[PDB]
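Researcher: Please predict.
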Amino acid sequence: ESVKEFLAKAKEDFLKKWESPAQNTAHLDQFERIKTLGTGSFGRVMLVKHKETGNHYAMKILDKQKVVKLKQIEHTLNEKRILQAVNFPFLVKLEFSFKDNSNLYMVMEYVPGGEMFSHLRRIGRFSEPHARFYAAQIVLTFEYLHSLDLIYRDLKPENLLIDQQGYIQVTDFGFAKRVKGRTWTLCGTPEYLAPEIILSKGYNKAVDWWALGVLIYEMAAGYPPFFADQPIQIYEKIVSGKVRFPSHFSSDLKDLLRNLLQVDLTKRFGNLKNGVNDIKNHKWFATTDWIAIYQRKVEAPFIPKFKGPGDTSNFDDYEEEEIRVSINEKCGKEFSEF
């Protein structure tokens, strides 16, 4: 009801920040390296301590030359620019960003509770009320992002962090893009790709709603709806339409998932005339108090063990490697606006 009013105000704040950024706001010298939290093909995330506050942060470190070689220039520029402009309770806040000769740096809020993926594998599956609690937060997050014409494109439990109150913090805006109408990039996780991405025909924000369906299925089942050894075999399952649900799934849940995992774009929930309200007013979400979820007033079904600021037991261990800053500036023009 009053959501329309809240979203107009959010759009005006976003457009103000999109137009006039604040940027280049710290340096590596101000941070003490503690532990590598995770690695990838073109960078890593480290736990860092701000030297003159003692505040802990998660610092994303990206190698410029590896970003260039793997064709991730625009994606990386989009990520920093989008994170600077957005403000929502379930999005990890960007605190500082900067660059040196070799690396790009994105300093973010540290979430000690770890990935939802890790909790999901340990427990096996989430109960339907547990899954619904998380699903509600993603629904609201996508409603916020889509109204700003932002597409997320990277939904999965690995990118969902559980804070000290048991609420979701969405990380990794590497595939996020502002797009009116259509876009074309073949990016994402094979299990989470919508059929229209695979078919290479151009797509819009509706791919996020497909991805929600995959997420809800995986939270409730413990495994994704489309799975095989080969990624090429996964694509074939996705496009064929057909989904098998576990027998323990409620018939309200099966019904929500058929309207989200819908190949026909003119029939997929979130994309229709009522839009997001088709999801919000669906029977499986009947006990959800949308306002209380937004305000974080609903008591969480799971609170991670807290072991002090700067504890990393919720994360895996990795070979600690130097942050090498070259004496020569690399890829100057490519990242000039970073």
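Model: The chain has two domains: 3-20+115-305, 21-114+306-336.
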